[PDB]
Amino acid sequence: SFTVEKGIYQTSNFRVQPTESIVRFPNITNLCPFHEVFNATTFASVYAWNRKRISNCVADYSVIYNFAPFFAFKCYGVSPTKLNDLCFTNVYADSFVIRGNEVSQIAPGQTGNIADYNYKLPDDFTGCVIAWNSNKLDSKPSGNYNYLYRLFRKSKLKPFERDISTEIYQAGNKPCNGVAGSNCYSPLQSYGFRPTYGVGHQPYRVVVLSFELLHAPATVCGPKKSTNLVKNKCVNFNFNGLTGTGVLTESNKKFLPFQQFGRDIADTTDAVRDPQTLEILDITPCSFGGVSVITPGTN
């Protein structure tokens, strides 16, 4: 209306706005050690590849890039930037040494000697592939013969399988009888590494990271950052999975050593312990109320 009589009218409401945000989370202590899968100085042979399981720790992938320029850094199922934002149940690391020009066969759907006789990958592999040159450390002028690889096999390999059986690969009709010679060849053949070899024949070190999910708790997740702690101001907060808006003040509650939160008669949170530093903090809502306009008649 365009005319107002004498009286008091309730018009609107108001609420104090938040100023900033606060995020708190426990200390990062159980670092997943990746400086052991990297730096082995001994990567064994491709036909006998080590498998290592990483579990029950915080995994930071920033330390991966701290090494030399990687010849091949390919990620298939996960965005490299989002490695710290998505987490899985367990992670498997596989390491070995192959030739320079055989790197292209370590990938899903590839076909080749190293692909189907020593290390076979599944079609839906999820993870990244690491490959960098190591000529200066795995080469001698005399010649290196400690890095073998399979050459003959009766059949192919199922994905994620190993075979160490060393028997005479029979090719002729007559029995080999466990001796070598005509149509009876040893299946394992050794590489040769010298400092003068051209690129494509120098030794290369390969590390493969695999992620998977199954019906179990994750128990392995990336490092989660946190902010500082502010008090006596209308602020937002996320105290280890609990979200709310209010003012943090000092509290005088005797929490037992195993509670994390506090409640009242009406089932509302009113006390939280700081995860980083054990201390009881009391929360109160930010002020609000109605607004009334007092006016005589517009006449």
Binding site: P217, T219, R263, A271
Partner: protein
């Protein structure tokens, strides 16, 4: 060596990790019913109540497993002077597994693969009460060490069972056994079971449970629960 005796008002644990002060709360969870059978000296069912009062600490360790053999995963706990070891290895146990004090050949014949480990302070350190429950891929335990005057039965009193540790294992438990360390000796312990019930807990101003009411024991308790 079966025997039977009353249970009285024992076996109440904190349902969660929430702090409350001077507030009566109602909970619907698994508890030991008041005034019930407890066997005196093993299917797991849905929970176990465990107690013992011998100082010699001959009882040490509980073997949780579905088959009690090397076929299926088994949870092994050992409490000794230094630490505690928790494994998910499928050991091959014996008919009467007991410690030698310290070869484990009598406890189990052989060990094999497993994918989880743990080490911490030993649980043991008078009547000691324990509760073992497993759910949603998590094996939670509770305990309480209480000094008890010279008595031949469970005292008339209340003692809450605080949580100790939770493990994300996710394996079923159907049977469990006892372990002793040995010369002839004697042991005394009790076994109880957990049942889905509804209680009414009372909190003091310091956040400790001091009293409880069973909502199905008798009509008066039902009236108390209804009136809160």
């Amino acid at each position: 060596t079966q025997s039977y005796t009353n249970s009285f008002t024992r076996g109440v644990y904190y349902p969660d990790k929430v702090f409350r002060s001077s507030v009566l709360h109602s909970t619907q969870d698994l508890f030991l019913p008041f005034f019930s059978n407890v066997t005196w000296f093993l299917p797991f069912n849905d929970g176990v109540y465990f107690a013992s009062t011998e100082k010699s600490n001959i009882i040490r360790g509980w073997i949780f497993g579905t088959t009690l053999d090397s076929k299926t995963q088994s949870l092994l706990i050992v409490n000794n002077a230094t630490n505690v070891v928790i494994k998910v290895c499928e050991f091959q146990f014996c008919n009467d597994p007991f410690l030698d004090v310290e070869s484990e050949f009598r406890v189990y014949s052989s060990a094999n693969n497993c994918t989880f480990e743990y080490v911490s302070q030993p649980f043991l350190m008078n009547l000691r009460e324990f509760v073992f429950k497993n759910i949603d891929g998590y094996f939670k335990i509770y305990s309480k060490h209480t000094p008890i005057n010279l008595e031949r039965d469970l005292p008339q009193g209340f003692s809450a069972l605080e949580p100790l540790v939770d493990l994300p294992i996710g394996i079923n438990i159907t049977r469990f056994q006892t372990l002793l360390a040995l010369t002839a000796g004697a042991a005394a312990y009790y076994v109880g079971y957990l049942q889905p019930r509804t209680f009414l807990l009372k909190y003091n101003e310091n956040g400790t449970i001091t009293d409880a009411v069973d909502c199905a024991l008798d009509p008066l308790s039902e009236t108390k629960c209804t009136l809160k």
